Amino acid sequence: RVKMHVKKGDTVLVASGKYKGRVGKVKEVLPKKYAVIVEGVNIVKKAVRVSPKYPQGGFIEKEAPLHASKVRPICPACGKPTRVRKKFLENGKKIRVCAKCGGALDT
RNA sequence: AGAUGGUAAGGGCCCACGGUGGAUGCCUCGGCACCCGAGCCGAUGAAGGACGUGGCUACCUGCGAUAAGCCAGGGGGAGCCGGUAGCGGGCGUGGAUCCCUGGAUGUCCGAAUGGGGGAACCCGGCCGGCGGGAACGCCGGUCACCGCGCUUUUUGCGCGGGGGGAACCUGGGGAACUGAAACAUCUCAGUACCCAGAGGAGAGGAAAGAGAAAUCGACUCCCUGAGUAGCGGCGAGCGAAAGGGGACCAGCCUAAACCGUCCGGCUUGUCCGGGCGGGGUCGUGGGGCCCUCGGACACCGAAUCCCCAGCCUAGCCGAAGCUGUUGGGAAGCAGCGCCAGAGAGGGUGAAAGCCCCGUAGGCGAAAGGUGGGGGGAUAGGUGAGGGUACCCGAGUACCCCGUGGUUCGUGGAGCCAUGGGGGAAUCUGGGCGGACCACCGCCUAAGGCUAAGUACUCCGGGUGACCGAUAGCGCACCAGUACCGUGAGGGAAAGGUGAAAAGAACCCCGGGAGGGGAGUGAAAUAGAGCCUGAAACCGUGGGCUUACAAGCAGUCACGGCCCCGCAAGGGGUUGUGGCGUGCCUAUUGAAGCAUGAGCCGGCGACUCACGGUCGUGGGCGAGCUUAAGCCGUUGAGGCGGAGGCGUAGGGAAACCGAG
RNA sequence: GCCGACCCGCGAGGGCGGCUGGAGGUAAGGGAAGUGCGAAUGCCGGCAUGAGUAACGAUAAAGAGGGUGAGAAUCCCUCUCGCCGUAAGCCCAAGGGUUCCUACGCAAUGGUCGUCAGCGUAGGGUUAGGCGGGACCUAAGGUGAAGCCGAAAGGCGUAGCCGAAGGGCAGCCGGUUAAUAUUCCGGCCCUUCCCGCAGGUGCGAUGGGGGGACGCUCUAGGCUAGGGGGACCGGAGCCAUGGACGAGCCCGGCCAGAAGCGCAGGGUGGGAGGUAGGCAAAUCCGCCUCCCAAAAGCUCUGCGUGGUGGGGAAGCCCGUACGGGUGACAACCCCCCGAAGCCAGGGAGCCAAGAAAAGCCUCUAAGCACAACCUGCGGGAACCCGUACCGCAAACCGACACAGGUGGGCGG
C-alpha cells in the first residue's frame, strides 16, 4: 500500500549523481522498492559461458536497474514536477504550468 | 705458562607484519513506558490446531475440495501473477495488482454437539441424491444433554444454553514464610493461589442513612480529613466514618389493601388456593372504600421508538530552483532566486523548506460500523378535604447462644450481617442514635431494576531529558524454535557486504578445497554471516640479551649493543652490583604452607517512591502555601483555598489562659 | 580503533600529532542519571594450561593377489587364517520413523582413514474377502442417562459405551521385481453378503436354557514336526603321496493337496408321562416315575494317502555386482530315532478349588403367514487403517556404533 510515486513510463531526464542530467526513455518502473531502469546505468555483467544462450564469450549485460527517487519530468522545457487537476471527468497532470499531461492517447 | 671477547638446541625482552577471536563506535523491519482512543469472539461452530493447497514448492504467510484464491459495492491509474531467485506462461486504459466494505466456498480436529475415541481417526439411525447400482461405496440434510415458555398427556414447536478471554471486577473457598529480633493472640492478609460467574466496565445504588445542628439528603470516584479517633501479649503494628472542597447527577419497577376476571378443588360456599389483569408505592405516611371540590381540555414525556450531522472501516489534492564547483558520490561551497496556515520528518550514493514520499491546509462513503449531538413519537407521571377503619413485605424483626464486618483482639460492645433455639406486631406498627431505662430526634426494614463519574490493558493511534543486539520483551532474525525431562515445565544461540549485485566470466596450479592475476566498484585491507577488527590468543621476520647460573622478577645506578637526534639529549636492550616478604578478603597480627581468582573482553551492586529530619539556596513574611479538579497549550501556562504549617501555652481531664 | 621519546593538570584526564576508519558528533554555561570493576570457587563469551601426553570401546586376528582411483591397512572381486555357532545364526512383536533400495557425492558426520556408509542428494519402493484391526464380544478398569452426596472444583456411580497378545472367527504351497508379497502371479481351499431359480421348515429376539469353559502335579495310544543310517536311488567331479576301484569320498533323496480310502481320537444315551422352577411366554434346560441300551449309532477333529500344480542339490561355465546358467526327463526309495507339539473338553492324582461375554445349539414372545427362515445350485457385490527397513541390536531404553538392558518362537 502507498507505493504511489510520481515517475511514469514515458521519457524523462536524469537528476542523479553518476550520469547527472541525462535524457532517458520509458524508464520501466521496477517495482515498488523505489527503483528505475531507463537508459543511464549501462553495465556489462560477468555471466558465464553458458553453452546455449550465453555462447562462448561470457562477459555481457544490457540495462542495469537504478533508484526511482532521482529522475525528473519533461515537456516544452525540461524538469518541473507534475500538477494534477481533477478535470471534473478524468485526470490532467500537466507539467508545472507548461501544459500537456503524460498519458496522451485522448487524455 | 699467563691473558681475555666469543656459539643458541632453544629461551626471554622490543618493534613490525599477521591469525584466531570477538569487544567497541555508529547504525536499527525490535522492544519500553506514558497518554489517548477503544473495549468483547461463540451452535451463522469461535479463540486455537491437522492434513492439505501453487504446474515444478521444505519453510513461511494467505488460504481451503471453488484451496497464494470466488462474485458484486467503493476506491485507484500502470503496473501485476506474495517473501524467493530460476523454469514456465499469464495480467491489464472493453481499465488489472492492491487498500475499504459485504457476502460465496468453508474438508478434518476444539464447548464438539449422532455414537465412539489414545484431538485431528473409526462407526451409525433416519430424509434424499450417484455409480448397472439392491448387495460395496461417495454426497447435501439431520441426530448429544441443560434451561425455560405454549402443545391433548402424546409426537413435539419454540427463544435461549455451553467454550474462551491480556488485564481488571462481584462473590464462594483461603495458606505460610516474615514481623513481633523467641513464639500462639495479632502481623503478613482476607494477600497469594483454587472456584463460580458476570462486562465494557464490573460491583454498587435512593436511605429502618448519616449525625446533634430543628444539619444534610442515591451509588461509584478524586483529594482533604488524617496516622486523625480508636484498636492491641497498650508490642508488632493495624488504623476508621463524619464534615469539607471537587468529578458525576437519575431516578425507579412490584407485593399486600380494594375490584374484576378464566382455572383447580372441595366438607357449594356471600369459599381455601391459583393464571392474568385492573390497581398502589410512603415520612406533614402513603395507598384502599364511600362521600366532599370539578375533575379535566392541558402539562410533564424518556433509560424505550426512530431519523440525521459529526466518529471509525481505504483514500484525495496539496506553496517554493537552478548554473558553476571540489569529490566515486552532493543536499556540501560559491553565486543569484523563491515558499510559508507548511523550517514536522524521512529518504535521495553525504549535511535539502523548494529532488521523491510528505508536514501545514482542505476534502472524502455506494457497502459495513457508531450515534442523545439535536428533532419527532411512545411507555409512563400532575390534586385540596372528611370519615371509615382494610393493607403496608415473617419463622422476619426481637430474644439467646455460638459468631463474622467495623477503629473495635471481648471491652461498658453497640450497630450491621447469621449458624442452632425459641419466637412478634401494622402507623400508638416499628430499627437506631454504642449496657440498659426515660425523653427527644432520624429513618420506614425483611421484593427487585439504575446511566455517567472510578478500575483495567489482549489491541490500535500518538509522545519521549526510554534501550540500541549481554541493552531491550524470553524472542530485532523463520521464537514460545532448537534442545533438555515421562511428565507438569525449563528455556538457547542467532543483526549490518555495497549507493547499486556491479556479488568475480577467463587462464593458472590443484580431486576438490582453496588460491595467483584478469576483471568489479570510490574503495575487494567492502570477497560473500564479509562495516568498524580491543585484548587474551597463537604465528613470522628482524634489534638487544642468554649454555658457573639462586628468583614476588622489578627498582637504581654503571658498563656495553642497536636505532634515533644538527647539538646536548633520547628510546630500546641487559653484563653487573646496591636493595627488595605478590594483589585482596579476614585478622591483635599474613609473604603466607589461611582464603578468592588460568588469562582476556563485556554484565554487574548503595537507588527510588512517601514521610520524617539537620542543614542549605532563594521568595514572601504574621502570615506561607494550595491537593483533587477545571480552563488553556501541543513541551505555554493559569485559575482553582478545600485543607496542612504558623500566630500560646499549662493541666490526665472540666477548665484556666501569659499564665 | 591503533602509535607515541610533545605540551597542560598533583591527580583522575585534556589538548597535539602520525596511522585506521567511514557520518556522526556538541564546546562555554546549566541540568537528568541504570555512571567509573580486580577480585564475589561471581554471569556470559573467547583462547590457552597439562599435553602432542591419557585414551582412540572388548586380546576372536589377521596375510596376500588383483581392481577402482588423484589417493587404498581402512572400499570391492579371489585366495588364506582364525571366532561365535541355545549364537555373535533365523523369526516375533515392542520400539524408531524412509534408516531399505538404485545412480552420483565426501565439506562436516564414523574416536585416523575413506573412492565405503545408517551421513548429502534427487529418483523410487510400502498393495489384501482370509495375517493384524475395525463396522463382534466381554475381563480387571474407565467413562457414564439416572440415584445419592459434596461450599465450588468434584467423589462413588446402576443401565448403556470404549477398552486384550484373553474368547471366537474363512489361506496353504512354490514363482517372481533393484527393493514389498499369506497382500501380485499361479496350482489348489474356503468364507461374506445381495438377487434369482429349486427344494425344504412354522419362521424368528437384544428375552430363557444348552454350550463356550478353563487349577496345579504326573501320564495314555497312535500321529507328526524335527532327527539319524542305508549296500539302495539320481549326478558334475575326484584315485592323489605308500595302499584301494572299496557298499570309496560328495551332493541331494520332497511341498502343497478339497471329494474319497485307511488310522487314531474328542464329544453325545435314545424314548414316554407329568410340572404350581427357570423372576411363566414356551415343546428348550431343569426336575420326580416308567421303556430299552450300556454296545452302538450319531458326530467334530488329529494323522497318513490321494487326482493335480510346484519344488529340487554337490560341482562346473561365465558373471566384478545380483546371480544367469549349469540343473538333471533330475533321484525324490527303505531301516531306525522320535517331539515338550497334534487328536481336546483324553486318563490318573491332589488341595490351594481352578475368568467373563458373544460366535455356535437352540425355546418361545412381539409379529408374520405373497413374508420370513434352512439347504442347494446359479448369477452379482465383499469395504476402511497396517506392511518398507532395523529388531537379543549402531536404527530400541540408556546424552555415544555405551561390552550395559530387551517378553515369546526355530535353534542343528
Resolution (A): 3.5
Q: What is the DSSP string of A24-88?
A: --------SSSB--SSS-B--------TTTS-S------B---BSTT-B--SSSS---EEEE--S
Task: Determine the distance between A74 (CA) and B383 (C1') in angstroms.
Answer: 90
- The answer to whether the CB of A7 falls within 8 A of the CB of A74 is no
Task: Determine the distance between A67 (CA) and B327 (C1') in angstroms.
Answer: 21
Q: What distance in Å separates the CA atoms of residue A8 and residue A91, rounded to the nearest whole number?
A: 14
* Cβ count near A22 (within 10 Å): 15
What are the CA-CA distances from residue A9 to residues A23, A26, A54 (Å)? 14, 5, 30
Task: Determine the distance between A106 (CA) and B76 (C1') in angstroms.
Answer: 20
- The residue whose grid cell reads 519533461 is A74
Cβ within 7 Å of strand B: which of A 30-49? Answer: 30-32, 43, 45-49
List the determination method.
X-ray
The x, y and z cell numbers of residue A45, run together, are: 555483467
Q: What distance in Å separates the CA atoms of residue A60 and residue A48, rounded to the nearest whole number?
A: 9
* B strand bases under 7 Å from protein CB: 77-80, 93, 95, 98-99, 314-318, 320-323, 327-330, 347-349, 355-358, 499-506, 519
Cβ neighbours for A87, distance < 8 A, ≥ 6 positions apart: none
Cβ neighbours for A70, distance < 8 A, ≥ 6 positions apart: A14, A15, A16, A17, A36
Q: What distance in Å separates the CA atoms of residue A20 and residue A74, rounded to the nearest whole number?
A: 15
